[PDB]
Structure formats: structure tokens, C-alpha cells
């Protein structure tokens, strides 16, 4: 579907960013022709919150830069341990 | 309003939890008689993501325990520096 393809592009762009350990949560909607989205990435649990927020900002910039129809994107982080099977992923 | 009072109770419960530096984002809806909500707390930027996630889990437990109609609550964290005016708050 339309949304599924957009979500796939968001996930691909985010996962290229240094420090990203997968996308854990992602929701998006159209508002008219534009996309509004909210996403949560995994990051190294030993990162500081400060470090994680820099990664989030980099993801925001990357995703917004690659996908023109996204009007609004919020990115936040949660822990994701290497070989984590306890959290969802995209 | 109905939702405003519920949101006020969520914020009060969350802000009592050790390590919480304010609620930055909160959205909630009714699904039938039950509430579904998503919230983002501020935490010390020097906390590890691991530490921040323990705070989030404590907030989840606290809020769910105080407000019976909440069926589903997701809690995540962002940085909030002391005397921060750069992020919204409740
Ligand atoms: Zn935010
Ligand atoms: Zn989560």
C-alpha cells in the first residue's frame, strides 16, 4: 500500500544513520497531501540521553531530506541491546 | 474538559516519579470507555538510555496504577536540562 511504501522509505533512511539500532515504532498519516509521522528508534543503551537525542535529530534530518511529502516528523529513542528480540522492529 | 482532567492526573502521577523532569509530550484518546495514551517525559541528559528506560517503566507503572481507565500507556524519554525552556511541558 501507499502508507506501507512511505513507511519502508522512512525505515530505510533512518537505519542508514550512524547509531540507529532499528526502528522500533513508527506511525504516520496523511493530512491532505502531506505526511505527519512519529517514530521511535533503538539506540545503544549505554549512550547518554544527550547522545541519543543527537542521533534522533540526525534521523529527523535524514528522513525529512529524503522524503519531500513529510511535513512533520518527531523522532525519539529507546534502548535496544544487540541481538534484542524483546522489542518490535521494522 | 474530560480529557484535560485525565491528562492533568497523568502529568501529576508521572512528575512524582524519581528522575522525571516534566512531561514534554502527552496524547490520549478514549477507545470506548478506556483510555489509550502515549507520553514522553524529560530526563537528565547525562542519564544513560538504560537508566532513562527504567524511569519510563516506573512512570508507566505509576500512572497505570493511579488511573484505572487507562488500558494502554507507552512512555518514552527525551533530554531535559535544568531550567530548560527549549521544549514544551505540561
Ligand atoms: Zn519531542
Ligand atoms: Zn516503545
From Swiss-Prot, chains A, B:
Essential for magnetosome formation; required for stable accumulation of MamB. May nucleate iron crystal formation. Probably binds and transports iron. Binds divalent cations, possibly up to 3 Zn(2+) per dimer in vitro, probably iron in vivo. One of 7 genes (mamLQBIEMO) able to induce magnetosome membrane biogenesis; coexpression of mamLQRBIEMO in a deletion of the 17 gene mamAB operon restores magnetosome vesicle formation but not magnetite biosynthesis. It is found in: Magnetosome membrane; Cell inner membrane. It comes from Magnetospirillum gryphiswaldense (strain DSM 6361 / JCM 21280 / NBRC 15271 / MSR-1). Fe cation 2 binds at residue 53. Fe cation 3 binds at residue 78. Fe cation 1 binds at residues 38, 74. Belongs to the cation diffusion facilitator (CDF) transporter (TC 2.A.4) family. This is Magnetosome protein MamM. The C-terminal domain (CTD) is probably responsible for hetero- and homodimerization; it assumes a V-shaped, dimeric metallo-chaperone-like fold that can open and close. Val-49 forms the hinge between the dimers. Binds up to 3 divalent metal cations (probably iron in vivo); upon binding there is a conformational shift to a tighter dimer. If the CTD cannot fold correctly the function of the whole protein is decreased, suggesting the CTD confers functionality on the transmembrane domain (TMD), perhaps activated by ligand binding to the CTD. Forms homodimers via its C-terminal domain (CTD) in the presence of metal cations. Interacts with MamB via their CTD. Isolated CTD forms homodimers. This bacteria makes up to 60 cubo-octahedral magnetosomes of about 45 nm in diameter which contain membrane-bound crystals of magnetite (Fe(3)O(4)). Residues 4-90 are annotated as: C-terminal domain (CTD). Disruption phenotype: Single gene disruption has no growth defects, no accumulation of magnetite, forms empty intracellular magnetosome vesicles, decreased levels of MamB, mislocation of MamC in 1-3 foci or rarely in a shortened chain. Magnetosome vesicles are fewer and smaller, aligned in a chain with the filament, only a few have very small crystals. Other, possibly precursor magnetosome vesicles are visible. MamI mislocalized to cell inner membrane or in 1 to a few patches. Changing residue 49 to P: CTD dimerizes, binds fewer cations. Loss of magnetic response, still stabilizes MamB. Induction: Part of the probable 17 gene mamAB operon. Changing residue 38 to A: Slightly decreased wild-type magnetic response, fewer, slightly smaller magnetite crystals. Significantly decreased magnetic response, many fewer, smaller crystals in vivo, isolated CTD does not bind cations.
Amino acid at each position: 500500500s501507499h502508507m506501507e511504501a512511505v513507511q519502508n522509505r522512512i525505515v530505510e533512511a533512518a537505519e542508514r544513520v550512524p547509531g540507529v539500532r532499528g526502528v522500533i515504532h513508527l506511525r504516520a498519516r496523511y493530512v491532505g497531501q502531506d505526511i505527519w509521522a512519529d517514530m521511535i528508534i533503538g539506540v545503544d543503551p549505554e549512550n547518554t540521553v544527550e547522545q541519543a537525542e543527537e542521533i534522533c535529530e540526525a534521523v529527523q534530518a535524514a528522513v525529512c531530506g529524503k522524503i519531500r511529502r513529510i511535513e512533520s516528523l518527531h523522532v525519539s529513542a529507546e534502548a535496544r541491546e544487540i541481538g534484542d528480540t524483546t522489542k518490535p522492529s521494522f
